[PDB]
Amino acid sequence: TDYPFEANNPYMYHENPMEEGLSMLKLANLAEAALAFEAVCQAAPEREEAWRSLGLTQAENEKDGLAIIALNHARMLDPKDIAVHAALAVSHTNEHNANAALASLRAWLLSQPQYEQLGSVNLFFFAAPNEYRECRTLLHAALEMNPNDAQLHASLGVLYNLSNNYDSAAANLRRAVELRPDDAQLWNKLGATLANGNRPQEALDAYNRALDINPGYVRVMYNMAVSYSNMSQYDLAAKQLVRAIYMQVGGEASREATRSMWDFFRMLLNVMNRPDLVELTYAQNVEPFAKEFGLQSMLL
């Protein structure tokens, strides 16, 4: 496989890890759920619901590369899984893969029976202007078919993040959340769009809502860290990153995946003049930082 499965895989033992993964999306954490879906993928790689679930989980878990690898499996096994195309559009946008992002948005739209006949229609992003135009036009055409479709607006928000048209992006993502205000991904998307469009305060209000809805949303925690750091609110940035770190490990390859976050943390500890805390980051134990930054629930 092309996916770096965790070696010491306790869910490889269990009876129904697919059921347990779905359960753990609601009742536990992303990391544990991804480990359970990893088990199913390993034992039964023809199950594209397993790959799909692994991929979706990993993106929320701040692991787009692993999300893409998983989602490409799901894509092969079921070229018509709408949600797989959507997640690929999002992760490829994050990864600055413009051709793949536009291909995934086009696939997203045309895999839907309600929009599939757009595939046969005759219809500033200068690095792929026809690919871009085609997607933009297809999504507009879909909006005329379906004007208050929340996911069309969200998908235009993605398209518009890819081309740095953050105002249009925000306006579409805003409408999306107005339609679906309990959707935590939509709030995050609106937040990320606002932050990158240099509106960090509004962004932080959007992120807060998203985390309220889904308190294990590690990507949101990271994003908040980023905005707080950007506004030079290092106490708040540091708290968010300890939470993210804590959630992201619920061990082995997973230990390694947290290292870049730890280094980002180390910078916040440096800038705030805490060389004593900086020294402690090299051990990679959260406990000292849970105490230091007021997250004492993590000591239970």
Binding site: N161, K189, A192, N196, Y222, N223, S227, S229
Partner: peptide, 5 residues
């Protein structure tokens, strides 16, 4: 650092 969708 970029925000992630």
């Amino acid at each position: 650092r970029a925000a992630k969708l």
